[PDB]
Design a protein around this ligand. Sequence first.
Ligand SMILES: [Mg+2]
Ligand SMILES: [Zn+2]
Ligand SMILES: [Zn+2]
Ligand SMILES: [Zn+2]
Ligand SMILES: [Zn+2]
Lengths: 263, 114, 232, 379, 65, 203, 46, 335, 56, 84, 43
Amino acid sequence: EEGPQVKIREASKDNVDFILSNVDLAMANSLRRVMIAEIPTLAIDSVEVETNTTVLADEFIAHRLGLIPLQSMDIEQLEYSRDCFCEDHCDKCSVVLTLQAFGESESTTNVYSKDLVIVSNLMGRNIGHPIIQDKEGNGVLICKLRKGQELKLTCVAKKGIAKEHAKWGPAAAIEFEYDPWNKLKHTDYWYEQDSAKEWPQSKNCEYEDPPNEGDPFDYKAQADTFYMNVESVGSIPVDQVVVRGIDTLQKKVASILLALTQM
Amino acid sequence: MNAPDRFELFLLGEGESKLKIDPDTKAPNAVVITFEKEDHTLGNLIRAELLNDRKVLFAAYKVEHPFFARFKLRIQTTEGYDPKDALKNACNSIINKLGALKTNFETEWNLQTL
Amino acid sequence: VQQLSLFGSIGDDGYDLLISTLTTISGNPPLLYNSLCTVWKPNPSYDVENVNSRNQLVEPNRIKLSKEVPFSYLIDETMMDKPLNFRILKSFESCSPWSLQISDIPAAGNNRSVSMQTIAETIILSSAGKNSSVSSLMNGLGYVFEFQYLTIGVKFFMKHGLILELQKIWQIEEAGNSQITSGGFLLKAYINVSDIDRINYTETALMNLKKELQGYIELSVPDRQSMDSRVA
Amino acid sequence: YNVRMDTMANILYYPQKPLGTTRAMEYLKFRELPAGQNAIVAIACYSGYNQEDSMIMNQSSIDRGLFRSLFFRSYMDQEKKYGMSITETFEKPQRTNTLRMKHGTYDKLDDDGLIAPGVRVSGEDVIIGKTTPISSKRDASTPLRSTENGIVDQVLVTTNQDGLKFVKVRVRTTKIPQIGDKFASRHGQKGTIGITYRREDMPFTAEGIVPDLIINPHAIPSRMTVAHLIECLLSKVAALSGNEGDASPFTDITVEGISKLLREHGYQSRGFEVMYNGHTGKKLMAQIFFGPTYYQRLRHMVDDKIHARARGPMQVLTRQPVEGRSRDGGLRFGEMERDCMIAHGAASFLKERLMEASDAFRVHICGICGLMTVIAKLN
Amino acid sequence: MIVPVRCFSCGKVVGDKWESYLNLLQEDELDEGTALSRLGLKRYCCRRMILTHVDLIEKFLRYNP
Amino acid sequence: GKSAVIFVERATPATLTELKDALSNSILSVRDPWSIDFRTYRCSIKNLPADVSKLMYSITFHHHGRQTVLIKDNSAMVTTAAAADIPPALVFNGSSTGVPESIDTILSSKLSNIWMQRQLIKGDAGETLILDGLTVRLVNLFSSTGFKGLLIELQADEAGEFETKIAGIEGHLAEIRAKEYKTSSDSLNEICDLAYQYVRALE
Amino acid sequence: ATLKYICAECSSKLSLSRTDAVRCKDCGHRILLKARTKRLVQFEAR
Amino acid sequence: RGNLMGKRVDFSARTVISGDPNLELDQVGVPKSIAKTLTYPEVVTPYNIDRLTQLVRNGPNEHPGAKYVIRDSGDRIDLRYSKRAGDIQLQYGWKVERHIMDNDPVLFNRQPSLHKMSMMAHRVKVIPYSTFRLNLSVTSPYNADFDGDEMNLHVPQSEETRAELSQLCAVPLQIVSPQSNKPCMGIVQDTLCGIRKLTLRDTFIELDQVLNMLYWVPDWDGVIPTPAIIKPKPLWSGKQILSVAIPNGIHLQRFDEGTTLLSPKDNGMLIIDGQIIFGVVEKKTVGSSNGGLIHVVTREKGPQVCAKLFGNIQKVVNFWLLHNGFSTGIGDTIA
Amino acid sequence: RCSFEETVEILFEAGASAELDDCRGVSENVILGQMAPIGTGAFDVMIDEESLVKYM
Amino acid sequence: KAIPKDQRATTPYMTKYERARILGTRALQISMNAPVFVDLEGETDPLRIAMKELAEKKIPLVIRRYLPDGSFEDWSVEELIVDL
Amino acid sequence: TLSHLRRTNTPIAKPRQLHNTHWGLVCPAETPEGQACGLVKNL
RNA sequence: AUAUCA
Ligand SMILES: [Mg+2]
Ligand SMILES: [Zn+2]
Ligand SMILES: [Zn+2]
Ligand SMILES: [Zn+2]
Ligand SMILES: [Zn+2]
């Protein structure tokens, strides 16, 4: 087609395995960094506690509520409250979640991310839905109550990035490898007898030609072709972790061009 | 307690420009751009692209201390060529490269049935 | 703005001599002038904390609105056909432009050679809308009318920006205007300063004027507390 | 823990049983009530922020709850009876009829003189209002420690053996691992956090794994803490295998045995893993010894240590600065410090420390008998 | 005490997987290593989260008020 | 005189130029650049009588007098911090000190307990495009949180044909794919309606 | 409405004032708690 | 012993110490809170009047602010409560008790204090986080580590006292000590470990990294040194790019067991005009050694120049090792 | 002598022997809170009106 | 007793301690609004002013150098060699 | 808590050293550093 | 006073 090229190896709701060729390592990495840190997500940010009869602390629970993944598909049409014009929050900038739970049962009563209810007007946008990947359809286990154990609270979810808090991290681990045969001599293999026998062969070795000993060292050789795997948490779909990552980095660069323009 | 606010990493300070371009004294046709509320994510990316420019003689960046999200980038170009223009072109090249990367990923993704 | 000043006074009978003296000393005869001031305070019905968004203490203060009026509004029929000069003082839709001022209590210091007061001022040029009267606008800011006074006098322009005002003040109420200065005139000498130098230079100018009138009329530094408009 | 009122209680948010365990721990109830968490630990040279017993923490992990802890302090106060008439009282003191009030705020007190549980507090604020009537009455109230803050957890009212009304107040905070915060492995390998890096800055395996902790290679040699390295290797196998790693003393487990098992899992037998630099993405020329190691959070946290003074309370007798952080004391410029100043030749710097910066006073003496006899009616 | 939502090292939600893991052990008799892997917990950082958890909450619930 | 303000919510720093070119064949000349500050204040009074806003807007025009118009509850107050704009009579009788400052400085330093600055939008290096009987001003508005949008100021002496002029500019916006924008030409004294229009288009 | 103090064991609400008798109604136990403020507390979810 | 010969003092501060590869030898990282408490009484003078008035305006809560104003009259104005804390108009001769600020001289000390070097004068550097940060090479004189050590800070109150600190006991002055007539500070840990690794014959650096390594040197002439290898592929050696930190005029010669002018084992040391000719840099060269690169630099160029060299050598070395990496495992005990 | 080890038994003897301390030791001036006669304080500093009037 | 200028035998060079004390003293005096004997070439820090005065030997101070017997030699800052 | 209920104090020939007779009765490692070293035994 | 910290 044009410049750098992609070749997807495997896909799911949760994973994207692909090959990125005709790219600078610096670019591959900068994208990898952005996916981890700069993609916006919606996550619980304020927790007003009306009642808590639980064995857990108000803030212990509060902390967990932030780590619960929320639907951030249409996150782009929500404003950062900081940029919003209200007094604290509103609809244009937040999602209000409610949680009322009580131990009616003699048996232990469980509190799940499913038990969260949206109270704010969604403006008909795909946002704030607790992500349920759970087979039984419960989502994240927030708490356990016994008998008169009541938990009544209110959550304000806000747009944010992983730089502010890791709760707004839409990506789990991002796998990243290049040159499975150390052709580039980018690592000096620690060994005891044989580095080839001692160090396990990469999966990606199959997608590259072995060096063949009867050849001189390619110094001219440079790093292109990157075997990556992007894992999603739920907030954004796997593809959009890649796309939005590409786009964020693009926007980030545009700001610099624009800054120079104003100067 | 002595902990700085987390947004200080990305949100520009009161009266604080993203870029501050100062000229290098020690070398002819060389400049020093300080990037506020930025990290390696952008620094190493730009530096590597300026390296691809033939008319660029020197390019390097450094995050002087990790408590602060800012980096100094030094650009030296051949006489007649402007380092601000060099930075402008590398910035553009990056965008155009990313634009193709997105297009190529999108096309390839749409082909998958999973 | 920093206003450095000194005050004094004289009884009605001292008028002519003082005018004659200031005319010779400054080289120019007096210039007639007036001004109406309306003072406003935070609405007592409303109540707000006295702190910043940064949670820093803020002291409630009065806002002063001031403008002029055409002299003809101060001359009745008995006053009619009387030289419109310095001698007259003896026989005593939208909003208009106004001067809006908030002042600070003068600078502290024992043995101050002059009074030094900081003054925050802005100018109101006009208004429009539902409630465009200056009164409504003050209310919109959360303030209410407290009191107002009229001042009539003569001024002298001197060197280095020194100005001398010989004034009479009347508080205004439907119950009637009462002359705060009944008996004589309030004398004021001052310079408005927008660097330490120009401040010490201005003090000198005032000190030389004080020195030049010593023996005849005395100019001194009024009590700080008497120049404090804070509400309490 | 939730039902007891003790001065100070430290509880770990998410305790973990160790991957490497002793057969003896079964009896010690350790796996049921643990003292730490299994951290992903890289023994590497990174930004040099892990030099001389310091360590780097994954700021990303810290956000996710790694090493956070609950903190409960309990403040007590009595309503004492001083003889036939004088009795202290629980109430909200009014500043007009009450002497020597605390500069802190009393607004958070209900009319019984207590804060209701749930209110958030902060430094210098008044938890318990008390007055010791003597005549109208002095202020005997209890303020929260100035170096701390949090939310009131529980407040209880009681009478004692003889029936003196007394009240206990619990205050809960959550302490999130900061910089000078001390941690150690189970091998006398202690240290404080030097810096916290986010996930992107951290070095990473091709597999996408990142360390929670970066400890310096320079620890290991001089110290000869071999079991630390073995703990790790075994814990790595344990984590993959899902079997309890037996780290018991006198056994037939060998570093070779564990090595073989790790190779069966796809990793390089001696625990090394190739890492990529977080800032550039470029492979590290070195391969990092990487795997889980059980790290402990210790009682020494920077914020309970940090202290500064510049004029403050003085003793009555000596008229010199009071003692300890607690009392807002000044530090001791002691004998050995005097010596260094004398060695430097800092004559005026010393005079200042001993006079202006502390003790300094003025007397009038007699010229005949060099005594402090002089009745100076200096006025 | 109480399963961590999200693995500390990579942040893969682990909050849902608890009961499911405990079930694959009692009901399925399965060994810990297979259950973890069944649940898709492949990286050791994620594995250690569940494998080394101590659900103290369950004891805490044993006290009346 | 007449005016209208168009605020392009959905846009990027580039949108300005895109619209700038859609007029390339309508342009005539280009006068000096302009500037503008848009502040939002929130009242701290807690007894505020029902239906009295808690919001007050401050619109500062640069070299439109260095003037600042305050707008609250559909009412406006025009102020100036320019000693050169002081009515001569006020300087002569001493009502004024001859050295004024901004109403915003006064608000933040003397009335800060009553009024708190919530937001501050600034538009620098704006462009003055001169067409046929219609002056069109363009400027990129920025907040403390990066780009905030594009602002179009439409001033026309020609009291007549105007509704057409505004519709025309809105059309060139359709061309550059600038959808989801707000336009105001409302009214409450020129400077006042103009100021009001900014409020309607931005609030 | 209003529960000044709660009971430690039986968990029955008490609502008593100054000099009322520091004890519970039914069970003996002089323990007694305080019951949360009605001034709802908000926490950052970080 | 306890109230006269030693006493506790005001303008003192104490906290947990931690290291920093980005601090200069002679500076000390001071937590914002500590800086906001400790004060220097500055006399209102034509030179500072405007600045001082601003810190007064800034007040006790903002960082570069002030706590008190001392009038001629003797009475102390508390900026925290004075109703006139805003409209405070300074007069020559008054004193503004202002916060401790970047580059103030301060006494830093690690107890016991069995050394004059156990108390040295550092430049303030107000920083975030609750720990006192120190340059790693200054670790040895104090005898500090970061396993939970705390350190003491004393603030001079007079222009005289400050001079005493800056002019007699400042860290650079203390480098060569009379205890053993040799340097008492040298290159340690990461920087020592990385310095050997960098300076092997095997060690070659590509252009990209050379540029970053060069820019990292804060006094770099702007001159890209000619690569030791010009085609096939321009390549620089460790020795080469380390020599950029070594100042001109610096001459050093050392022969270790088996050193020839051909140094086959890359033995000993040969630095001509502050450029390494042969041998690997390690403890004997860059440590707190009698013949040391440091001993020569302090003596030949100055204490201020040598102090800069510490920072320089570390900024290059640490940067290089950050990207090279270095670890240690059980495999290293296996024979 | 009293600042090391024998303190009170040294000051009693100091009394009955009517000792006179010339205050040249560093210890004395420290007890007295005066600038010790060591390095910086081993000499005196004077203004000379001659040299002063010479520079102007 | 005071040793005559023609019989002075202490170093013709200024001691580290002397220089530190002169700089301290001048800086202190400069800071207490004392008259400055040099062109401040934009200088504002009294120590940097002191350094400048000593650099041009325009400091009107004299070092009274005491000998163990009690006698002394007076030396002008203008006359002392500053090799430090 | 456990190790505190197994602590031994020894008040006032070479007591601090680990004796052979301490085998199986007292912990060879659990002892303080400084002043009380080897005088505080743990069962 | 015990415990503890380097
Ligand atoms: Mg230590
Ligand atoms: Zn909003
Ligand atoms: Zn006597
Ligand atoms: Zn994980
Ligand atoms: Zn009961």
